[PDB]
Amino acid sequence: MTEYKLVVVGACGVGKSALTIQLIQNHFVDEDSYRKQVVIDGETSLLDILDTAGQEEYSAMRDQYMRTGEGFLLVFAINNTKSFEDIHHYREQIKRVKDSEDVPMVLVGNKSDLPSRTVDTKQAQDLARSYGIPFIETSAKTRQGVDDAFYTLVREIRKHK
Amino acid sequence: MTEYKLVVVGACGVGKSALTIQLIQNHFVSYRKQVVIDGETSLLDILDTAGQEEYSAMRDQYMRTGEGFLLVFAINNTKSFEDIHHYREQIKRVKDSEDVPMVLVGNKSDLPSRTVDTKQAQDLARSYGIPFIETSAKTRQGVDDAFYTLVREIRKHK
Amino acid sequence: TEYKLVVVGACGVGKSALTIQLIQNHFVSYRKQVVIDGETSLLDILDTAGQEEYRDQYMRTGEGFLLVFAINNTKSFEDIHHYREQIKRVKDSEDVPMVLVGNKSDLPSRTVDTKQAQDLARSYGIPFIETSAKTRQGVDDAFYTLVREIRKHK
Ligand SMILES: Nc1nc2c(ncn2[C@@H]2O[C@H](COP(=O)(O)OP(=O)(O)O)[C@@H](O)[C@H]2O)c(=O)[nH]1
Ligand SMILES: Nc1nc2c(ncn2[C@@H]2O[C@H](COP(=O)(O)OP(=O)(O)O)[C@@H](O)[C@H]2O)c(=O)[nH]1
Ligand SMILES: Nc1nc2c(ncn2[C@@H]2O[C@H](COP(=O)(O)OP(=O)(O)O)[C@@H](O)[C@H]2O)c(=O)[nH]1
Ligand SMILES: *CCS(=O)(=O)NC1CCN(C(=O)CNc2cc(Cl)c(Cl)cc2O)CC1
């Protein structure tokens, strides 16, 4: 059976854990590792997921997951300009550790349910276009885009393989 | 607000009209509907192709006009599933693009006489890189999901 | 039970094509026995095509009116106001059964949008039905809806 090691990266507080909880546990209320078998396009897939902002205690485990991670969600929040500005850093770090220019990634703009917006959808779309990766708008609260984000990433991994 | 022109294609008798009627009128025996998808209100305009679709020239016109396509087969009609590749190839040819919003739809899911397995259809959709939704115009299973997913694919393309 | 229906609208909007599609069921004063709302009805349909504008008896006698414009003919839509006002004046009533009909819906382009027509029909307090005499889309709906409006009035 196929396993996918996924890493969810982005600034503290953008909703990485919330997105992963919604995917895996199917709830939201207002732990950084998860493991579950799902079915994606008829293929049974074990997802092994790590959420990380890059500043957590277990750096050794983080470096391991970065090296073996097959795909990455690059997450910012639409009401957090700094988190959007941080995306380039995260992508550059992944490319360095993987020593590759072809790493499966999806850009995720979370908290789309909130009326406070400081990052334009066009900004994000433009950035994702430059990187050659999909952009998905999500809300961990309403479930908007959550399956799409993770499943699109799994589809990017298959493309790569 | 944003209007999306949608075209439902597939073999005669797979339930394209039935799917449309179930979407718009919530009935199983009007082509426009306002919907909210992912927080955005949109107008679905399903092109009415009845009568005219028998002519290739008109089919070409509808394909050029449409922004996204449901590729419908019936799960108790193997030939209708086999016909899907041809229909997709015509859309790609006419719109001169290898990237056109489409969703694969396996209709009549309520029937026991299934001859097209979920796996066969999933494999096809995975190859095309498009969503696959199983539907029944009779029970309403999957009907909103099929059309709303197509809108999502159109939005991604644009 | 007889219903006297009158089809009005600018030249070339499809008044005759709609009438013939209803009666004879093909695309190019009339009577047709129909069943509507379970009731057997005799429809007397006056196609005013070619009728000279200079028909007081037909209007006063007419029980319901199809106000037809073509969705690719802005002027024909503008002309609907004329017909509406003329009929209300001549019949001397504010409650005359009418249906607004936007014909030629099969054409690939349109210059009168659905919202425009829906809003005008709302102003008038009448139904709006999009039709194609060519494909028969909406044709029965238009005439049957008018019969229903007459019944509500009666
Ligand atoms: N309204 C809203 N709040 C969210 C969303 N995602 C996360 N949150 C909230 O944002 C805060 C931080 O989320 P968290 O998952 O801990 O962020 P992380 O540090 O990236 O793992 C929490 O209070 C969450 O409930 C969302 O999509 N919408
Ligand atoms: N049992 C079942 N019958 C269906 C379904 N959808 C359509 N039908 C029937 O299939 C036949 C053809 O449907 P229709 O909408 O006319 O097909 P079209 O030619 O693709 O537009 C009709 O007898 C419908 O009642 C479905 O989901 N379940
Ligand atoms: N494409 C299309 N042409 C129509 C339709 N209805 C009428 N026509 C054409 O428009 C022209 C005028 O139709 P006609 O019935 O004579 O209009 P009238 O003057 O209002 O009675 C003719 O060439 C018809 O064939 C329709 O629904 N679609
Ligand atoms: C149901 C018999 S029919 O001859 O009237 N319609 C056929 C025509 C051939 N065909 C398709 O090409 C696939 N469906 C389809 C494609 C397009 Cl582009 C359009 Cl506009 C409409 C339809 O139905 C099957 C149905």
Q: Show the 3-state SS of B34-72.
A: EEEECCEEEEEEECCCCCCCCCHHHHHHHHHHCCEEEEE
Q: Does B58 touch chain C (CB under 8 A)?
A: no
Q: Residue C134 gets which letter from DSSP?
A: T
Chain A touching partners, 3 or more CB pairs below 8 A: B
Interface test with A, best of B119, B156, B158 (most A CBs within 10 A): B156
CB-count burial class (<10 Å; 0-12, 13-18, 19+) for B84: buried
Q: Does A147 touch chain B (CB under 8 A)?
A: no
For residue B21, which phi and psi values (nearest 5 degrees)? -65, -35
Report how far ligand 3's centroid is from the alpha carbon of C17 (Å): 5
Report how far ligand 3's centroid is from the alpha carbon of C58 (Å): 23
What distance in Å separates residue B122's CA from the closest CA in chain A? 6
Is residue C8 helix, strand or coil?
A: strand
- CATH code 3.40.640.10 for C1-154: no
Chains A and C make contact, 3+ CB pairs within 8 Å: no
CA–CA gap between residue B100 and residue B130 (Å, rounded): 10
Q: Which tokens belong to C43?
A: 């429809």
> Per CATH, which fold does A1-161 belong to?
Rossmann fold (3.40.50)
Closest CA to ligand 3's atom 28: C104
Comparing alpha-carbon positions, the chain B residue that sits nearest to C130 is: B30
Distances (CA, A) of A66 to A23, A155, C28: 21, 19, 71
| Alpha-helix runs per DSSP H in chain C | 15-24, 56-61, 74-78, 80-91, 114-124, 139-153
Residues with CB under 6 A from ligand 2: B 10, 12-18, 107-108, 110-111, 136-138
CA–CA gap between residue C37 and residue C1 (Å, rounded): 13
Which secondary structure element, helix H or strand E, spans residue A149, and what is its range?
A: helix A146-160
Q: Are C7 and C45 in contact (CB under 8 A)?
A: yes
Type of residue found at B139: T
| Alpha-helix runs per DSSP H in A69-137 | 81-85, 87-98, 121-131
- CA B141 to mean position of chain CA atoms: 14
Report how far ligand 3's centroid is from the alpha carbon of C113 (Å): 19
CA–CA gap between residue C79 and residue C111 (Å, rounded): 14
Going by C-alpha positions, the residue among C91, C44, C66, C64 that lies closest to residue C150 is C64
Experimental approach taken: X-ray
What distance in Å separates residue B25's CA from the closest CA in chain C? 15
DSSP string across chain B: -EEEEEEEEESTTSSHHHHHHHHHH------EEEEEETTEEEEEEE---TTTTTSHHHHHHHHHH-SEEEEEEETT-HHHHHTHHHHHHHHHHHTT-S---EEEEEE-TT-S---S-HHHHHHHHHHHT--EEE--TTT-TTHHHHHHHHHHHHHHH-
Going by C-alpha positions, the residue among B12, B119, B79, B92 that lies closest to residue B132 is B119
Is residue C110 helix, strand or coil?
A: coil
Contacts of B56 (CB under 8 A, 6+ apart): none
Q: Are C12 and C21 in contact (CB under 8 A)?
A: no
Which secondary structure element, helix H or strand E, spans residue C31, and what is its range?
A: strand C30-36
For residue A49, which phi and psi values (nearest 5 degrees)? -120, 135
Which secondary structure element, helix H or strand E, spans residue A109, and what is its range?
A: strand A105-110
Q: Are C2 and C44 in contact (CB under 8 A)?
A: yes
Q: Which tokens belong to A131?
A: 């990187």
Closest CA to ligand 3's atom 14: C14
Helix axes B143-157, B16-25, angle to 10 degrees: 90
Characterize the bridge pairing of strands C98-103 and C128-130: parallel
Q: Does B39 touch chain A (CB under 8 A)?
A: yes
Q: Which tokens belong to B153?
A: 């694919």
What C26-29 contacts at long range (C-beta under 8 Å, 24+ apart), as own/partner pairs, is C27/C133, C27/C134, C27/C135, C27/C136
Q: Which tokens belong to B32?
A: 């426009």
Going by C-alpha positions, the residue among C118, C115, C113, C73 that lies closest to residue C100 is C118
Query: Which of C106, C108, C114 is opposite residue B32, by nearest beta carbon?
Result: C114
Closest CA to ligand 1's atom 14: A15
* Resolution of the structure, angstroms: 1.6
Ligand 1 in contact with A11 (CB < 6 A)?
no
CATH class of B1-158: alpha beta
Q: Does B158 touch chain C (CB under 8 A)?
A: no
